[PDB]
Write a protein that binds this DNA or RNA. Structure first.
Lengths: 78, 89, 100, 97, 92, 78, 102, 89
DNA sequence: CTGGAGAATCCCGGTGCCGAGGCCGCTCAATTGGTCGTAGACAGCTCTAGCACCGCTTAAACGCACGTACGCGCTGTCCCCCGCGTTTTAACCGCCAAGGGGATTACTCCCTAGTCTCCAGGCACGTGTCAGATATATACA
DNA sequence: TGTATATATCTGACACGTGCCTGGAGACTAGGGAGTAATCCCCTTGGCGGTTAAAACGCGGGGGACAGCGCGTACGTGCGTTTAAGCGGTGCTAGAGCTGTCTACGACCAATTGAGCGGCCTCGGCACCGGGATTCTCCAG
C-alpha cells in the first residue's frame, strides 16, 4: 500500500510548490494514477533492458536509457 | 519503392480492394519510418551491453520496448515463431 | 528466397541489405532481419487488414489515404504508433464534439 | 487563542516551498514501492538504492512538470482549483490521452 | 438559421482532403518571406502545397487543442488567451 | 503583403473545420502571427538544408528532412 | 594534446577517437570535432560563467546545481534548448502568478 | 569522464569559484548528452549529403540548425578562430 | 482603514568535517613518424522543369443590413482547504551477517565479413478498361 | 431544398504486360566477438534495534466555482459585384544529373610518452548553531 505511502499532505505540499489554493480530493488519486502509469512505464521498459542484459540487479543506467528515450533526460548520474 | 511486397501481401489478404499510388508511397514512407525507429533503438541497444553485433535478441527486446502489450505479444508470437520456422529449414 | 527458408514474404536479403548499408555496426548477425521483416510483415498484415476492411466497408473500392486517416484514427494502437505522424491526403476522421 | 488568518499562512508556505529546492515525500515507502511494484514482473530483484533516490528525484521533477503545467491550465480556466478535467485535459494536450 | 448549413460545411471540410487557400499568393508569400535568405528559389509547387499540408495540419491540431480549451472554458468563442494557453502548453 | 493571400474566409473555414462559431477579428491576425512563426521556422531550417546542400532548386526531400526534424512525420512523399 | 596545440582544453584525441568509435560514418574529418569541442568550450564558458555569477549571487564560493537550474531557466537560449531536459537536485524557478496575489 | 576539463576551463573563467562534484556530474552528463545530440544530427545530415565524411561545414550546419541565434555565430567565431588558427601549422 | 506583537528571516559570530582541493607515482591513452587506395568537388551541359507573359472568367472575395446569440458582470452557495492543535507509526539512525553478483582469470567457441558469380527476381517502361467522374434521366422530403 | 436511384459515355489509373538487368546468395575462410567456467569479495538484502518526526485527524470558517439573470454586443447570412485566382497556353529559361577527374585523407603499424588515473592527505567552506537585528504581518485602531 505504498502508493498510499506517498502521503496526501505530501501531495498537498506538491501543490505548495505547485501553487494551488483549493485542492479537490480527486486530484490526489488521479495523481497516483498518472504516477502509476509513468512509473510502471519506466520500470516496465527498464526491466526489459534488464532482462536483455541477463541480469537480476537493476542499475540506474536502465532509467538513464529509458528517460533518455522518454524525452525527460536526467543528469548527474552517468 | 515498397510496392512489391505490400501489393503482393495485399493480393494475399484483400483480393477485391483497390489502392492509390499516394497510399503506396505512404506504405513506403511508413516502413522507412518504423524501420529507422527499430534500427535506431537497437543501434543504441547493442552498445548498452557492450555488444557490436546486431542479432535478433536485441530486436525482440526492442519490440518488448516499443509495442504496448497485446500486439507486442502478437508480434513476439508471429515473428518469433516465424524465426522458429526459419530455423526449421 | 530466405523468406522461402522462413515461410514468409518480406525480403530477407533486401531488408538485410538495408541493415548492412544502414551503417549501424561493423559486423551484423543475420538473425536480426528475419525477426525484423517478420514483425514488419505482421504489423503490415494488420494495418493492411484495417486498410482493406476500412475502405472496403465504407462502400468504396480503392483504398484512399482518407481511409488511412480514419483507419488510423479509429485505431488506438496505431494512435500509439502514429501519434506525431501526419497522413497526406487524409483529412480528419468524422470527429465532431458533442458541444459542436 | 493564538490564531492566524484562514488562508494567508498557506500562501506564505507556498512561497517557501516554491522558493526552496527540496523534495516532499518519504524515502522508504518509495523504496518499498519500487520493490513492491517491481516484484510483479521478475523475481529476485536487487536494487541500487541511489537509483531509487534518482527515480524519486525524477519522479517529483515530473510532478513539478505536472502541477505547474496543469497549474497554468487551471489558471486559464479562471480557477485556483485543480479539477480532474485540468489533468486529463492537459495530458491530452500533451498527447498522453 | 445561422449555422446548421455551416455545420454541414464543417462536415464537408472535415470530409474533404484538399486545400482551400489561393495557391499563387500563398506561393508568393513563401517566396516573399523566403527572400530573407535568398531571393527566388526554385520550388516544386506541390512542395509548397505540402508545406501548406503540414502547416494547416498543425493549424487544425491547434483548432482541436483550442477546441478542447473552449470546451474547458465553457465557451464556443475562441479567444487569443485560449491560444495563450494552447501555445503555452505546447511551449510557444 | 501576401500574408493577406491567407484569406480571412479560409481562416473561417478552417475554424469551422475546428468547430468554431463566434470568430473574433482578433483570431485572424493571431493566426497570421503564430502561423508565420512556424513559417519562419520552416523557411529558416529548410534554407539551412538547401544552402547547406549548395543547390538552387528546393526539392521536396529537403522539407521531408525539415518536418522530419520537427517531430512531424509526413507520408506519401517517399 | 592537440587542444593546447589549437588553443583549447577539451580533449581532441578522446572525442575524435569517439567520433570513430560511435558508429556514425565511415571517415571522420579532422577539423570537425575540434570545431565542435571549441563550441563546447564556448557553451561551457556560457553556462559555467553564468554558474559562477549566480553562485556569487547568493554570496557563495562553490557551485550547487541550483545555480545551474536558474542559470538555464533564466536564459532564453538555454531554456529554449533545455525545456524538456531535467537536471538533478536543481530545484524550481520561483514563479508567483496573479492567482496568489490579491 | 570530462570533470577535469570543465575544471580547467572553469578556472580559466572563474578562478575564484568552487564547484560541487554533483554539479560536476550534472554538467559532465550534459556535455555527453549534447555530444550524442550533435553525433546524431551529424549522422542524419551525413546521411543526407550521403557523404562518408563529416566536416566543419556539416557540424557548423548542425549547430546553426540547433542553436538559436547570434551566440551561435560567436561560437562560429570561436571555433573558426581556433581551428583556422590551428590549420596552417 | 494604518499600525504595531510576534513570527520570518537574515545576520553576526563558532567549529569542526571531510569535500573539494591538492599531491604522488605510473602508466595507458593519446599522439604521431611514417604508408595507402582513395572521395568528393568542379568542368561542361543538358532537358526537363520551373518561372513568366498573354489572355478570358468566377466562386471567392470584398462590401454591407441586419438581427442575432453569446461574453460576461452581480449576487448567492455551502462546503471545503485551510487553521489550531494532537497523536500515533513507521520513518529514521545505527547495526550484523551473507551470498550474489559483478568482475576477473583467460577459455573457448563458430561466425560473420570478403569474393565471384549468377541469373531470375526484379525493375524499367508501356496500354486498357472499367470504377468512378460526370453526366442522363427519375421519384420523393 | 436535400436526397435517393437507375442510365451513359468518358477518363485515366492502376493492373497488366514487355524488355532489360541487378542483387543478393553459395561456398569458403579467419580470427575474433562474445558467451563461459570458475569464482571472490564485498556489498546489497534483509533483517535487528533504539529514536522521533510524520502525518493523520478532528473542528470549524468564510469565501470559490459555478449559477441565475441579464445587459448588451459582434458577427454570420444574404446579397451585389467584380475580380484576381484560376486556367490554360505557350515562351523563356537555367539547375541537378551524368561523366570524369584527380589527387588527398583517414585507415594502419607501431612507437612514444606524459596526463590523467588511482589513490591519499587536507584546509577551510560551510553546515548547523546560539543568539540578535530587522521586516512582515494578523489583528487591533
Amino acid at each position: 500500500d505504498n502508493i498510499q505511502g506517498i502521503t496526501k499532505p505530501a501531495i498537498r505540499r506538491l501543490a505548495r510548490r505547485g501553487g494551488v489554493k483549493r485542492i479537490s480530493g480527486l486530484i490526489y488519486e488521479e495523481t497516483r494514477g498518472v504516477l502509476k502509469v509513468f512509473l510502471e512505464n519506466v520500470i516496465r521498459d527498464a526491466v526489459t533492458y534488464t532482462e536483455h542484459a541477463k541480469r537480476k540487479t537493476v542499475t540506474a543506467m536502465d532509467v538513464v536509457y529509458a528517460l533518455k528515450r522518454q524525452g525527460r533526460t536526467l543528469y548527474g548520474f552517468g | 519503392s515498397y510496392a512489391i511486397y505490400v501489393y503482393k501481401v495485399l493480393k494475399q489478404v484483400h483480393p477485391d480492394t483497390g489502392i492509390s499510388s499516394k497510399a503506396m508511397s505512404i506504405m513506403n514512407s511508413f516502413v522507412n519510418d518504423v524501420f529507422e525507429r527499430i534500427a535506431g533503438e537497437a543501434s543504441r541497444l547493442a552498445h548498452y551491453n557492450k555488444r557490436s553485433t546486431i542479432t535478433s535478441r536485441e530486436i525482440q527486446t526492442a519490440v518488448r520496448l516499443l509495442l504496448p502489450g497485446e500486439l507486442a505479444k502478437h508480434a513476439v508470437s508471429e515473428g518469433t515463431k516465424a524465426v522458429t520456422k526459419y530455423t526449421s529449414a | 528466397t530466405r523468406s522461402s527458408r522462413a515461410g514468409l514474404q518480406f525480403p530477407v536479403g533486401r531488408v538485410h541489405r538495408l541493415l548492412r548499408k544502414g551503417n549501424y555496426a561493423e559486423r551484423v548477425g543475420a538473425g536480426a532481419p528475419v525477426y525484423l521483416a517478420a514483425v514488419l510483415e505482421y504489423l503490415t498484415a494488420e494495418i493492411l487488414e484495417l486498410a482493406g476492411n476500412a475502405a472496403r466497408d465504407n462502400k468504396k473500392t480503392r483504398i484512399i489515404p482518407r481511409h488511412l486517416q480514419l483507419a488510423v484514427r479509429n485505431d488506438e494502437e496505431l494512435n500509439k504508433l502514429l501519434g506525431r505522424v501526419t497522413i497526406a491526403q487524409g483529412g480528419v476522421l468524422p470527429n465532431i464534439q458533442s458541444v459542436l | 487563542p493564538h490564531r492566524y488568518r484562514p488562508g494567508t499562512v498557506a500562501l506564505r508556505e507556498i512561497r517557501r516551498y516554491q522558493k526552496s529546492t527540496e523534495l516532499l515525500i518519504r524515502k522508504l515507502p518509495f523504496q518499498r514501492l519500487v520493490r513492491e511494484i517491481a516484484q510483479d514482473f521478475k523475481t529476485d530483484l536487487r536494487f541500487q538504492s541511489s537509483a531509487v533516490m534518482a527515480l524519486q528525484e525524477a519522479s517529483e521533477a515530473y510532478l513539478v512538470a505536472l502541477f505547474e503545467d496543469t497549474n497554468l491550465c487551471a489558471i486559464h480556466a479562471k480557477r485556483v482549483t485543480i479539477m480532474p478535467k485540468d489533468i486529463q485535459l492537459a495530458r491530452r494536450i500533451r498527447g498522453e490521452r
